[PDB]
Amino acid sequence: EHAEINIFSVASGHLYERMLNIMMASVMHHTNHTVKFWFIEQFLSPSFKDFIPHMAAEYGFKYEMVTYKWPHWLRQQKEKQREIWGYKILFLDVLFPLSLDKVIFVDADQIVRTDMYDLVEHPLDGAPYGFAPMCDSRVEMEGYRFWKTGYWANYLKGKPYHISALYVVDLQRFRELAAGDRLRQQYHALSADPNSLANLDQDLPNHMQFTIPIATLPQEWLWCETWCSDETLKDARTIDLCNNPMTKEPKLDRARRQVPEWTKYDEEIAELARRVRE
Numbered sequence: 001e002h003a004e005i006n007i008f009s010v011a012s013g014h015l016y017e018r019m020l021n022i023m024m025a026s027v028m029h030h031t032n033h034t035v036k037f038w039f040i041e042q043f044l045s046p047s048f049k050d051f052i053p054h055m056a057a058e059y060g061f062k063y064e065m066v067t068y069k070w071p072h073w074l075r076q077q078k079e080k081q082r083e084i085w086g087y088k089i090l091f092l093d094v095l096f097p098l099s100l101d102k103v104i105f106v107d108a109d110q111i112v113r114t115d116m117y118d119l120v121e122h123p124l125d126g127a128p129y130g131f132a133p134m135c136d137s138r139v140e141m142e143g144y145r146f147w148k149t150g151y152w153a154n155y156l157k158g159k160p161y162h163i164s165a166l167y168v169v170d171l172q173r174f175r176e177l178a179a180g181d182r183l184r185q186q187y188h189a190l191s192a193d194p195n196s197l198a199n200l201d202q203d204l205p206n207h208m209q210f211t212i213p214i215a216t217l218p219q220e221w222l223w224c225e226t227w228c229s230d231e232t233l234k235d236a237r238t239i240d241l242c243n244n245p246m247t248k249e250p251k252l253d254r255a256r257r258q259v260p261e262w263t264k265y266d267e268e269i270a271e272l273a274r275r276v277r278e
């Protein structure tokens with residue numbers, strides 16, 4: 001459709017819905033371009049869906065709910081987490097109208113600190129999608145970078161192992177290449193082995209990057225404390241909260257501690273909620 005910036009996300013649970021409102025507020029506080037948010041409807045709570053028109057009127061954004069049913073032929077995922085990961089990567093060509101030329105996935109737990117139109121304008125050199133690589137800058141976490149040894153090191157041949165927390169999809173090129181049909185057919189064949197695609201949303205594009213190119217985004221597009229150094233935080237365009245296998249610190253504790261403006265957005269959205277309620 002007509003918005004300059006089009007973002008979709010997936011959220012399941014009260015905690016992720018609370019963070020999704022914060023992510024949306026952070027996008028609008030950093031851009032003057034028109035924005036439309038797209039929601040994978042079936043995982044959201046009724047209260048979240050009822051509150052979105054109030055967020056839209058307060059922050060000045062458009063929105064649309066997409067309800068796409070998992071195709072009968074396509075191998076299902078019994079685990080809700082894996083089903084949600086399937087919705088991130090398997091249906092990019094069918095979730096959005098043919099008129100939409102580009103969409104960006106932003107994780108529900110992200111904090112945006114840049115004008116997202118800079119990602120819309122980032123050149124992809126013919127790639128149907130662009131992902132940031134996993135950071136190598138936090139050196140003390142090298143033992144946990146599973147992609148630097150074993151299966152992935154041999155498979156990648158020096159190519160980056162990309163994180164799936166943020167990605168830009170040129171829907172025109174994605175369509176042109178039949179990337180959706182190709183990703184669903186590879187997923188269907190690979191998923192017959194239950195050990196394959198452990199990190200479904202991330203492993204599938206990384207696996208297919210020799211035939212479905214990935215434009216490797218600048219590292220500054222995605223900063224996560226687990227893999228990225230403190231020194232590179234000042235250059236981060238977006239901040240992602242991702243699992244830390246070494247510390248196992250809780251999600252809300254990480255959010256409040258890392259990002260000074262997280263509490264500001266959280267309190268601002270709670271103030272908007274009290275204003276609408278009364």
Ligand SMILES: *[C@@H]1O[C@H](CO)[C@@H](O[C@@H]2O[C@H](CO)[C@@H](O)[C@H](O)[C@H]2NC(C)=O)[C@H](O)[C@H]1NC(C)=O
Nearest residue numbers: 027028029030031032033113114115116117118
């Ligand atoms: C959105 O538009 C406003 C208003 O034009 C911009 O405000 C300017 O902000 C800079 C600092 O960032 C100030 O030095 C200017 O004096 C402001 N101008 C006015 C007229 O208020 C704002 O920067 C814009 N934001 C984005 C992300 O484009």
Ligand SMILES: [Ca+2]
Nearest residue numbers: 107109240241
């Ligand atoms: Ca995340």
